[PDB]
Amino acid sequence: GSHMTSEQFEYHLTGKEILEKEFKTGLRGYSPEDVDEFLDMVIKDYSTFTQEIEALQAENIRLVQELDNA
Amino acid sequence: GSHMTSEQFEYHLTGKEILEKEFKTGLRGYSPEDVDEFLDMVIKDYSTFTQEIEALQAENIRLVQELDNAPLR
Ligand code: NI
């Protein structure tokens, strides 16, 4: 009967891991303030990506469950 | 036939921007090698997130098309 495919998405980091990452420092290096400001945006985007996927999964569930009554 | 729209989510960066970003240097900054290796994972994750979202959006559009044509009662 009905057969679903299965796809897997592999991620390297979590927002938490980015929040908790401590870079080593050296004689010359990237401006800590500038890197921090940039990663702040990255962490926000990880949260937003996660939320949008959750929203899209819920929308998927909504549509599938409607079709349950077809 | 009638439609409404929303703008639910706000993003700050693209993967391309993270690949291309050039940081100012200074005394006692973060290890460039360490930061670059870290951001490489971020870049790959942005691409994967983006792919997953676009795949779900395509799937949902297929399902809405199916539902448009489906009798329920
Ligand atoms: Ni079968």
3-state helix, strand, coil in chain B (%, to 5): 60, 5, 35
Q: Say whether B29 and A24 touch across the interface (CB within 8 A).
A: no
Number of domains in chain A: 1
- Best of B35, B65, B69 to substitute, by most chain A Cβ atoms within 10 angstroms, is B35
- Best of A2, A6, A12 to substitute, by most chain B Cβ atoms within 10 angstroms, is A12
Q: How was this structure determined?
A: X-ray
Q: Give the number of other Cβ atoms within 10 Å of residue B30's Cβ.
A: 25
Long-range contacts (CB closer than 8 Å, 24 or more residues apart) made by B59-68: B59/A60, B60/A56, B60/A59, B60/A60, B60/A63, B63/A60, B63/A63, B63/A64, B63/A67, B64/A63, B66/A67, B67/A63, B67/A66, B67/A67, B67/A70
The experimental resolution of this structure, in angstroms, equals 1.6
Domain of B36 in residue numbering reads as: 1-73
- Which stretches of A5-63 are assigned E, i.e. beta strand? 25-30
Contact B66, A65 (CB under 8 A): no
